């Protein structure tokens, strides 16, 4: 898996948009997308939201968790704890990147939101680094990584798994 | 506090090992041999207690203090009287220190308060001076004795104690020092410099200052290549209540190692068998094996082997002297491998000093005066030939040396002594060395139609001081050209097994030795197609390591001349000297003199050494006569 | 002994990016000739061992047999790695290879490539009701239905729909559906312009 | 309190700059540049970052203005902010990495530099940007950042006393703080520095000479003292051209006039520059550069491209420009198992007529070579070329100073006016040219230095212009020196109507084009890139001759020797130009240089063919 | 879409079609001959009993049997106690590239010869890998758009593979964050064929 594919998975999350067009209910294979009425909010997958924004057909609304006070509390909690804390979204980094890159005009205080998400990302990456070092140094056979998102795992997963494969083979040399 | 007690407990546990017994036995030996320093291998400590080893290497002074306290307690446990004998017991370290292996360039501030192992060359030494440790004083009026302890920034527990001795008691009654009851330790300072081959491009080598105390004094002399294990400290100072904040740094040694072969029984048996195998072929094989990368100059290589082996110097009951050192001169056309043979001897001989005619002076060759670092005392520093005492001096571009500088070489070349009469200093220095010199003729390229004396352009006395003189000519011969070209191109195609294709030699190198003992013998070198060719390999090559061991063992033998050899040598000397115009074309390169007879004796003795024989026999004399016959005459071409 | 096969292996090892060098015909023939020589010497030794009951020859027979096996292993590894690179060619460029690349391949390698191409076409045809699914396309996740493309070289007529085509000339730009341009982009004919 | 509040506010602003600064656009993406660099460097174990002044001005103009006007205090605040941000980016950390490290903040700007001559009193204590040449570097020494002091009498200790940066000392407390009652009073000056409690950093001192083009007419170049510390230490070496950002400062020694200070003028002080950032001027390889170099080496006509790029202003001399290219790249240095070395450097001599651009070629190679020294034979001495023995002013002891061939170690030394050199001075170079070492035995110093450099020499003939009738009398050099040259070019100014017209038009067009704004040439490589390409190849590739190439070389060498031997016999005079084993190894070196241009591990028969053609045109032509 | 056959040198047996394994088994290994070997004297005519030779690992593995009929195998100095002690002091400073490019793979295959020091060779290989992991992970995941020649200089072949994987992960995320991961580009092979 590469980062583009994790972003592809993240693009299936639902967000809210206000369209400037009228459309009847669409019966997509994935699921119905309610009628579109100018000025009224509607929930759609992130990929369709980004596409409609790029075509000047909708205005995006920030998710509930994309709030400065909530994000500051979450960053402080993440810094205080030892393990990974539960995240507002399983694709918070990708959602933040896409929404703030394409609709900053629609999201007030986007710079603060980006900085807080960056802080959380840095803390969690450091925790994952500590976890990997502990796994190798203490010669573990298994680990628990709860509340860790797919993008975080994918950032260094291949390296860690290859190292663990080599280490296991070195641990099982003497068995005939 | 508690950490110090725990460290002392751990170290005492480490040295009480009868329940494998290596350090219990080492301490017993220390007692038996009258020593007060125990050398500890950090690998054993790391094996038995890793945390204690890491702390020792990273917090050196406190850990060493605890270690030495524990050692004193253990020694007292084995024998209390011996412990009372010595003020303190010291600990030296050896083994692998990981990243603490450094050079004077890589020894930086990040290694402060750490144990480090430095490798380098000793450039400067100082005089040994006593340093007061404990002072004892007696009061004649009150009949009581008082003791004082001293320490400085250089002691393990740094504290700037006062140097002034007590002179009176708290009561006014006066005090007198008991010098024979006080304690003093020897103290010396040296400088260790980066190895020039390791320096980066365009950079002069860096240096570090080292402090040797107690037994470690005089373990190293200038010119040595040493490995010093010690602790790295800064010496902060103040003046008028002001500090610059820039501090000198010193290395406080705990162990000094040299970088004298060690012989095992198997190696001794191999050497004895090699000597026994052949009677006449040993010398020829050894000479053939000397500098493999040079296509043959066979007689010159035999002469260089004789030079390395040497003769036997005679001391007479009256006190007269006859030298045993063999001197060789090579005069030649450009590009005939003279400098390469000199460089090979420089790389292989145990003590060899390089010198260039244009880059040397009489002072630099013999000795120099300067002010002592302390007290400004007129002191002497050894020159090249004194540093080469019982060694070799290789002088390249001999014809470029100034005549006045050349004249200073006569006394060393003949008598082996240097007389210093300057700056209120009158000394006789021992410079008993063999001279290997290379030169070009007066016209650059030897003129065969002129005589040897006119080409060489040197005075007969200097030529007489050389045991052998070799005229090496480049004669364009298609077959010789083919052979030399094949050899040279094979040499240039060679690639060492470790290296990969396309690799370039770097300018400079990082520290490669990662232990005090090298973690890594066979008589004959393994065959390599490029190094030796596709020939059937009928001639075998003796390996470099075996050659180094064999020559060391042979140099100690002193063959005794026999009556038959003496008769043959006398007859041959008479024939050599009487023969005038022995060949009408032939001319003498050097005059035949009684020095020629001494040279015959020297060469025969060296040949007998090569065989490891206790007597000089007729074969050795015949070989010496053959060498002299080849060297002393040259045909002159007529146009 | 096995140094020629070692040269065969080293040639491929020196190019770890998958490029196909020219087939080493002379090296392969050398290896085969050496194998025949080894086999003949072993046959003579085996016959003598049977005839005269000389045990001392068995180590030599084993040594030669091991050398033969080593030569075989190196040959097969070389050929198989070449096959892997050729296989990658199909998925990286397409069904029709540039003549430059065809030049390096041996004739037998071209036959292998043609057979593999036919098998892949059959499998891709078998997936769906009509025409199946061409899984050589859609190599990256899709973002937009249409994209902007610039012609990096002259290519001539290019069919958009059966009715209509467009002329590809250098430094012209076209706004086209992505699924019609992916293949030419992967071949270095078009460049994807992001604005 | 108020000062503390102001300092805290400024530190907060620096911290926010480090946390929030971003590069990119909403069309492409965004990167938190400085936070990411700090996080990566800290993980790598490199505790420094480099901050652009323009970025800081973009974030907060007042902060940049303060940093320019009062560098010391605000730089300290910026370093504290950097330490804070480094903790947050890496804060959960693995075992053995608990203690947070200090961060050195380097400074970089796009502003135009100012000269040494322009450094005036009114700029004291300001941030300055200065270009120059490094002429001297000191040894690495230890400078205290933190000290602990202890009382001689009572053992009362004051710990963690901060030290000022730069060339500034500290004044110890005059009196101790222990209780007056009960104990006899503590003596004056009771405090001493505890050796093991001191935290130190590496420091260095440098001399920076003004640029040669900036020197006023008729004046000796001026220099300035530089103070470097931590990661700035040991970055530059003598000969480097640099631009330094620093603080114009004053040495703060003891207030007292100890030893009865008796200066020639009153209230004078010593100036220096406290270095905050170094930029080495062209006059590590990025992956983009390395890919570009690999592309160049693979061009089918790379040899032609490099030759066309050597002194493009000179009208002809194609064979001499091809040989200079080989000298620039060099051969492969080797060490045989017995310990004997074979040199890989190539020596070249141009002997010829006046006004033939020999000196212009030497000047170009000085600029083009990664390491290059230009000297004159007339203005040289034996000690100046190799190395000198002299007295050290501070130590009162003999030391060693390297000459031209020590400064040019690893590069090229261009010796112009080689014929004007004295014979005693010329002879001092023989060892360095072949053994590539310098042996010294003087004044109690016995040492050996490295001199692995290529010699490029130019000279005139004995009679000024080469006279064909005089024959061997045209050359005055000894056979020993001449055998140490791989290639010898006899340059004859041949008069021809057609070539002379072409040369004149080229020279005129060259003088008119001096006004034209510089433009690139399709078939050439600019000097800056060629200089970097040469350095890359020399470190990456050491070629060897192929077994087939060696057989071809062996047979031609034998023929060449016979022809030289026959020619001398017929002429009845031993030729001035010798053909020895050194000339065989010279052809090997030239073949390896040609391969090194193409980054090829093995030299082929075509390489030997070109090497033999170069030898034929240069040295065999001279010898016959 | 090109993936060479992967190395199997750390397992009980090496992979038949692995180029890395063939190169690794090309490396030599000291042996002592336990039987006269006729008709092969030309290559080292008989080779006398007790002779000492250096053989490629593949050839030694072929002739070796547990009862030591044809030859007996001795460990290279790199895997003996002298060097094992050096490794334990600090495994990060030893140059595993110069001391055998396939250091781990070669040492793993030495366990087939049933030496009395097998447990010590095995334990040393594991501790060396563990002691070097943190530096490899940090350098590979934090050296961005920089020269890595000094970072991989001392790494062996197996470690250089891990370093390349770590660099790939770092580069992919940087490309995604900068917005370069969405452009459709010419294939890797096409780039190396038509623009190199
Ligand atoms: N017979 C030979 N065998 C091998 N290499 C040789 C031989 N003759 C010369 N060479 C090589 O050729 C070069 C000769 O240079 P060298 O310094 O040894 O010559 P030289 O006799 O000392 O010359 P000069 O009197 O000019 O200093 C060196 O590379 C040397 O290795
Ligand atoms: N072929 C040429 N193409 C271009 N300019 C040339 C050429 N030959 C000479 N010049 C110019 O003419 C002048 C020649 O002076 P220069 O110092 O280079 O000559 P030189 O050959 O080294 O002479 P000398 O032996 O008298 O020192 C310089 O201006 C040089 O630029
Ligand atoms: K003074
Ligand atoms: Mg010489
Ligand atoms: Mg000139
Ligand atoms: Zn006090």
List keywords for this structure.
part of a larger assembly, 5 chains, C: about 200 residues, mainly alpha, Methane Monooxygenase Hydroxylase, Chain G, domain 1, three-stranded antiparallel beta sheet, two-stranded antiparallel sheet, 6 helices, elongated, D: about 625 residues, alpha/beta, Rossmann fold, five-stranded mixed barrel, five-stranded parallel beta sheet, 26 strands, about 35% helix, binds adenosine-5'-triphosphate, binds potassium ion, binds magnesium ion, binds zinc ion, replication/dna, helicase, DNA replication, cell division
Q: Which range best describes the helical content of chain D: under 10%, 10-25%, 25-40%, 40-55%, 55-70% or over 70%?
A: 25-40%
Ligands bound here?
adenosine-5'-triphosphate, potassium ion, magnesium ion, zinc ion
Question: First CA to last CA of chain D: what distance?
Answer: 90 Å
Provide a count of the helices of chain B: 21
**β-strand number of chain D:** 26
Q: Biggest sheet of chain D: strands side by side, in what order?
A: 5-10-11-13-12
Shape call of chain D: elongated
Using the 3D structure, state the CATH architecture of one domain in chain D. 3-Layer(aba) Sandwich
In terms of DSSP E residues, the strand content of chain D is 15-25%
Strand order, largest beta sheet of chain B = 4-8-9-12-10
Beta strands of chain B, count: 27
Distance between the ends of chain B: 95 Å
Mind describing the biggest β-sheet of chain D? 5 strands, mixed, barrel
- Cα gyration radius of chain D (Å): 31 Å
Overall body shape of chain B:
elongated
Helices of chain D, by number, come to 19
Class inferred from helices and paired strands of chain B: alpha/beta
Protein name (chain E): DNA replication complex GINS protein PSF3
Organism (chain E): Homo sapiens
Family (chain E): Belongs to the GINS3/PSF3 family.
Subcellular location (chain E): Nucleus; Chromosome
Structure, described:
This is part of a larger assembly, with chains A (176 residues), B (639 residues), C (195 residues), D (624 residues) and E (196 residues). Chain C is built from six helices and five strands. With 195 residues, chain C is mostly helical. In chain C, helix 1 runs antiparallel to helix 2, helix 1 packs parallel to helix 3 and helix 3 (58-92) crosses helix 5. The longest helix of chain C has 35 residues, at 58-92. Chain D has a domain at 288-624: Rossmann fold (3-Layer(aba) Sandwich). Helices cover 35% and strands 23% of the residues of chain D. In chain D, the strands form eight sheets. Chain D has a five-stranded mixed barrel. A five-stranded parallel sheet of chain D has the order 17-20-23-16-24. In chain D, strand 6 and strand 7 (157-162) form a beta hairpin. The termini of chain D are far apart. Chain E has a single domain (1-179), classed as Methane Monooxygenase Hydroxylase, Chain G, domain 1 (Up-down Bundle). Chain E contains seven helices and five strands, in the order αββββαβααααα. Chain E has helices at residues 19-25, 57-63, 81-89, 103-109, 118-142, 157-177, 188-194, and strands at 28-33, 37-38, 46-47, 52-56, 71-73. In chain E, the strands form two sheets. A three-stranded antiparallel sheet of chain E has the order 4-1-5. In chain E, strands 2-3 form a two-stranded antiparallel ribbon. The longest helix of chain E has 25 residues, at 118-142. Classes of the chains: A mainly alpha (176), B alpha/beta (639), C mainly alpha (195), D alpha/beta (624), E mainly alpha (196). Chain D: ADP binds at residue 342. Chain D: Its main location: nucleus. Chain D: It is found in: Nucleus; Chromosome. Chain D: Residues 302-508 form the MCM domain.
């Amino acid at each position: 898996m590469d980062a583009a594919e994790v972003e592809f998975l993240a693009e299936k999350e639902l967000v809210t948009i206000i369209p400037n067009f009228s459309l009847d209910k669409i019966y997509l294979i994935g699921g119905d997308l309610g009628p579109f009425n100018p000025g009224l909010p509607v929930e759609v997958p992130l990929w369709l939201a980004i596409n409609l924004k790029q075509r000047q057909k909708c205005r995006l609304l920030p998710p509930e968790w994309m709030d400065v006070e909530k994000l500051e509390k979450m960053r402080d909690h993440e810094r205080k704890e030892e393990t990974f804390t539960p995240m507002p979204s399983p694709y918070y980094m990708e959602l933040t990147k896409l929404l703030l890159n394409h609709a900053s005009d629609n999201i007030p205080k986007a710079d603060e939101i980006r900085t807080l998400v960056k802080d959380m990302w840095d803390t969690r990456i450091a925790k994952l680094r500590v976890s990997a070092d502990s796994f190798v140094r203490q010669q573990e056979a298994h680990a628990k990584l709860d509340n860790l998102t797919l993008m975080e795992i994918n950032t260094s997963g291949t390296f860690l798994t290859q190292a663990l494969n080599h280490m296991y083979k070195l641990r099982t040399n003497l068995q005939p | 506090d508690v950490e110090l007690r725990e460290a002392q407990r751990d170290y005492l546990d480490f040295l009480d090992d009868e329940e494998q017994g290596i350090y219990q036995s080492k301490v017993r030996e220390l007692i038996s041999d009258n020593q007060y320093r125990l050398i500890v291998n950090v690998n054993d400590l790391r094996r038995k207690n890793e945390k204690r080893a890491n702390r020792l290497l990273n917090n050196a002074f406190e850990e060493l203090v605890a270690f030495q306290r524990a050692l004193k307690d253990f020694v007292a446990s084995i024998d209390a009287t011996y412990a009372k004998q010595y003020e303190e017991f010291y600990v030296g370290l050896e083994g692998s220190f990981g990243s603490k292996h450094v050079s004077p360039r890589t020894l930086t501030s990040c290694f402060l308060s750490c144990v480090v192992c430095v490798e380098g060359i000793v450039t400067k030494c100082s005089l040994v001076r006593p340093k007061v440790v404990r002072s004892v004083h007696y009061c004649p009026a009150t009949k009581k004795t008082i003791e004082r302890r001293y320490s400085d920034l250089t002691t393990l527990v740094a504290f700037p104690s006062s140097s002034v001795y007590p002179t009176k008691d708290e009561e006014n009654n006066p005090l007198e020092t008991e010098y024979g009851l006080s304690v003093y330790k020897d103290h010396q300072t040296i400088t260790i410099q980066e190895m020039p081959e390791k320096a980066p491009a365009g950079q002069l080598p860096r240096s570090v200052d080292v402090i040797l105390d107690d037994d470690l004094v005089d373990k190293a002399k200038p010119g040595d290549r040493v490995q010093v294990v010690g602790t790295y400290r800064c010496l902060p100072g103040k003046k008028g209540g002001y500090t610059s904040g820039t501090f000198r740094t010193v290395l406080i040694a705990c162990n000094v190692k040299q970088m004298q072969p060690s012989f095992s029984a198997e190696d001794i048996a191999k050497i004895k068998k090699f000597s026994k195998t052949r009677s006449k072929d040993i010398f020829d094989q050894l000479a053939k094996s000397l500098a493999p990368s040079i296509h043959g100059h066979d007689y010159v290589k035999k002469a260089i082997l004789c030079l390395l082996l040497g003769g036997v110097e005679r001391d007479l009951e009256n006190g007269s002297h006859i030298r045993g050192d063999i001197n060789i001169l090579l005069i030649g056309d450009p590009s005939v491998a003279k400098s390469q043979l000199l460089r090979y001897v420089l790389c292989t001989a145990p003590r060899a000093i390089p010198t260039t005619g244009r880059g040397s002076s009489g002072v630099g060759l013999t000795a120099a005066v300067t002010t002592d670092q302390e007290t400004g005392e007129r002191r002497l520093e050894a020159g090249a030939m004194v540093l080469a005492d019982r060694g070799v001096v290789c002088i390249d571009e001999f014809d470029k040396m100034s005549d006045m500088d050349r004249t200073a070489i006569h006394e060393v070349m003949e008598q082996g002594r240097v007389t210093i009469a300057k700056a209120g200093i009158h000394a006789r220095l021992n410079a008993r060395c063999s001279v290997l010199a290379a030169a070009n003729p007066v016209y650059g390229r030897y003129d065969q139609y002129k005589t040897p004396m006119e080409n060489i352009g040197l005075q007969d006395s200097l030529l007489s001081r050389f045991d052998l003189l070799f005229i090496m000519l480049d004669q364009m011969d298609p077959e010789q050209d083919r052979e030399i070209s094949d050899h040279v191109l094979r040499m240039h195609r060679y690639r060492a097994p470790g290296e990969q294709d396309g690799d370039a030699m770097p300018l400079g190198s990082a520290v490669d030795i990662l232990a005090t003992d090298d973690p890594n013998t066979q008589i004959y070198e393994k065959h390599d197609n490029l190094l030796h060719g596709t020939k059937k390999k009928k001639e075998k090559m003796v390996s470099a390591a075996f050659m180094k061991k064999y020559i060391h063992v042979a140099k100690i033998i002193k063959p005794v001349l026999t009556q038959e050899s003496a008769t043959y040598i006398a007859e041959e000397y008479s024939r050599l000297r009487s023969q005038d115009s022995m060949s009408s074309d032939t001319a003498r390169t050097s005059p035949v003199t009684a020095r020629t007879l001494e040279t015959l004796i020297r060469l025969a003795t060296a040949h007998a050494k090569a065989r490891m024989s206790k007597t000089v026999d007729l074969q050795d004399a015949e070989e010496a006569v053959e060498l002299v016959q080849y060297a002393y005459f040259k045909k002159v071409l007529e146009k | 002994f096995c140094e020629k096969a070692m040269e065969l292996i080293r040639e491929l090892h020196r190019a770890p990016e998958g490029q196909l060098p020219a087939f080493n015909e002379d090296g392969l023939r050398q290896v085969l000739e050496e194998m025949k020589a080894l086999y003949e010497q072993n046959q003579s030794d085996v016959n003598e061992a049977k005839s005269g009951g000389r045990s001392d020859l068995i180590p030599t027979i084993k040594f030669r047999h091991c050398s033969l096996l080593r030569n075989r292993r190196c040959t097969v590894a070389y050929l198989y790695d070449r096959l892997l690179r050729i296989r990658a060619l199909r998925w990286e460029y397409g069904s029709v290879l540039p003549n430059a690349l065809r030049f390096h391949m041996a004739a037998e390698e071209m036959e292998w490539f043609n057979n593999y191409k036919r098998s892949l076409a059959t499998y891709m045809r078998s997936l769906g009701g009509d025409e199946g699914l061409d899984i050589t396309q859609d190599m990256k996740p899709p973002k937009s239905l249409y994209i902007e493309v610039r012609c990096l070289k002259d290519y001539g007529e290019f069919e958009v729909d059966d009715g209509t085509s467009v002329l590809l000339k250098k430094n012209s730009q076209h706004f086209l559906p992505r699924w019609k341009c992916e293949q030419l982009i992967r071949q270095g004919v078009l460049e994807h312009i992001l604005s | 309190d108020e000062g503390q509040a102001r300092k805290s506010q400024l530190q907060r602003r620096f911290k926010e700059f480090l946390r929030q600064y971003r590069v990119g656009t909403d069309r492409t993406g965004f990167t938190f540049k400085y936070r990411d660099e700090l996080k990566r460097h800290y993980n790598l174990g490199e505790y420094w970052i480099e901050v652009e002044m323009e970025d800081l001005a973009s974030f907060d103009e007042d902060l940049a203005d303060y940093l320019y006007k009062q560098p010391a205090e605000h730089l300290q605040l910026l370093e504290e902010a950097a330490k804070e941000v480094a903790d947050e980016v890496t804060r959960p950390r693995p075992s053995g990495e608990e203690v947070l490290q200090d961060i050195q903040v380097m400074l970089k700007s796009d502003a135009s530099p100012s000269s040494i001559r322009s450094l005036k009193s009114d700029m004291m204590s300001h941030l300055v940007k200065i270009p120059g040449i490094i002429i001297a570097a000191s040894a690495v020494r230890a400078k205290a950042t933190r000290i602990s002091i202890q009382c001689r009498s009572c053992r009362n200790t004051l710990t963690n006393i901060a030290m000022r940066p730069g060339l500034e000392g500290y004044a110890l407390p005059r009196k101790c703080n222990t209780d007056q009652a009960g104990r006899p009073k503590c003596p004056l000056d009771p405090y001493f520095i505890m050796p093991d409690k001191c935290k130190c950093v590496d420091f260095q001192t440098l001399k920076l000479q003004e640029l040669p083009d900036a020197v006023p007419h008729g004046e000796m170049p001026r220099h300035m003292q530089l103070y470097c510390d931590r990661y700035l230490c040991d970055k530059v070496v003598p000969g480097n051209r640099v631009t330094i950002m620093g603080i114009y400062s004053i040495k703060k020694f003891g207030l007292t006039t100890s030893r009865g200070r008796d200066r020639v003028g009153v209230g004078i002080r010593s100036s220096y520059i406290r270095v905050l950032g170094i930029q080495v001027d062209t006059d590590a390889v990025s992956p983009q550069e390395e890919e570009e170099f690999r592309r160049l080496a693979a061009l089918p006509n790379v040899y032609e491209v490099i030759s066309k790029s050597i002194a493009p202003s000179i009208f002809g001399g194609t064979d001499m420009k091809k040989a200079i290219a080989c000298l620039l790249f060099g051969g492969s240095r080797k060490r045989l198992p017995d310990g004997l070395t074979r040199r890989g450097d190539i020596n070249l001599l141009m002997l010829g007529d006046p006004g033939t651009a020999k000196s212009q070629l030497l000047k170009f190679v000085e600029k083009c070579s990664p390491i290059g020294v230009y000297t004159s034979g007339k203005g040289s001495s034996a000690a100046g070329l190799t190395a000198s023995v002299m007295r050290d002013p501070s130590s009162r002891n003999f030391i060693m100073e390297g000459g031209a061939m020590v400064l040019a170690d690893g590069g090229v030394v261009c010796i112009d006016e080689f014929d004007k050199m004295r014979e005693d001075d010329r002879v001092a170079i023989h060892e360095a040219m072949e053994q590539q070492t310098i042996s010294i035995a003087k004044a109690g110093i016995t040492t050996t230095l490295n001199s692995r450099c290529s010699v490029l020499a130019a000279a005139n003939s004995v009679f000024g212009r080469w006279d064909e009738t005089k024959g061997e009398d045209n050359i005055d050099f000894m056979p020993t020196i001449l055998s140490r040259f791989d290639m010898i070019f006899i340059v004859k100014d041949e008069h021809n109507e057609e070539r002379d017209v072409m040369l004149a038009k080229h020279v005129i067009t060259l003088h008119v084009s001096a006004l034209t704004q510089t433009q690139a040439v399709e078939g050439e490589i600019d000097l800056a890139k060629l200089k970097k390409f040469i350095a890359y190849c020399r470190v990456k590739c050491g070629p060897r001759l192929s077994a087939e190439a060696a057989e071809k070389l062996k047979n031609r060498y034998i023929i060449m020797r016979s022809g030289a031997r026959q020619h001398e016999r017929d002429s009845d005079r031993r030729s001035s130009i010798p053909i020895t084993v050194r000339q065989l190894e010279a052809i090997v070196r030239i073949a390896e240089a040609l391969s090194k241009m193409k980054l090829q591990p093995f030299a082929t028969e075509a390489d030997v063919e070109e090497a033999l053609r170069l030898f034929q045109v240069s040295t065999l032509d001279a010898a016959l | 879409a090109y993936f060479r056959v992967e190395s199997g040198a750390l397992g009980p047996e090496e992979n038949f079609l692995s180029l890395d394994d063939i190169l690794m088994s090309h490396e030599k290994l000291p042996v002592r001959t336990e039987t006269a070997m006729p008709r092969l004297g030309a290559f080292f005519n008989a080779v006398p009993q007790g002779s000492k030779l250096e053989l490629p690992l593949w050839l030694a593995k072929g002739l070796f049997d547990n009862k030591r009929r044809i030859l007996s195998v001795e460990l290279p100095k790199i895997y003996q106690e002298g060097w094992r002690t050096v490794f334990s002091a600090d495994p990060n400073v030893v140059d595993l590239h110069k001391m055998g490019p396939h250091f781990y793979g070669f040492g793993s295959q030495l366990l087939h010869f049933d030496s009395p020091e097998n447990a010590d060779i095995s334990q040393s290989l594991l501790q060396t890998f563990i002691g070097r992991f943190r530096r490899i992970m940090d350098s590979s995941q934090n050296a961005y758009n920089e020269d890595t020649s000094a970072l991989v200089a001392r790494l062996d072949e197996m470690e250089r593979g891990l370093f390349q994987t770590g660099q790939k992960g770092l580069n992919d995320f940087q490309c995604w964050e900068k917005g370069q991961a969405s452009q459709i580009t010419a294939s890797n092979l096409v780039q190396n064929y038509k623009k190199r």
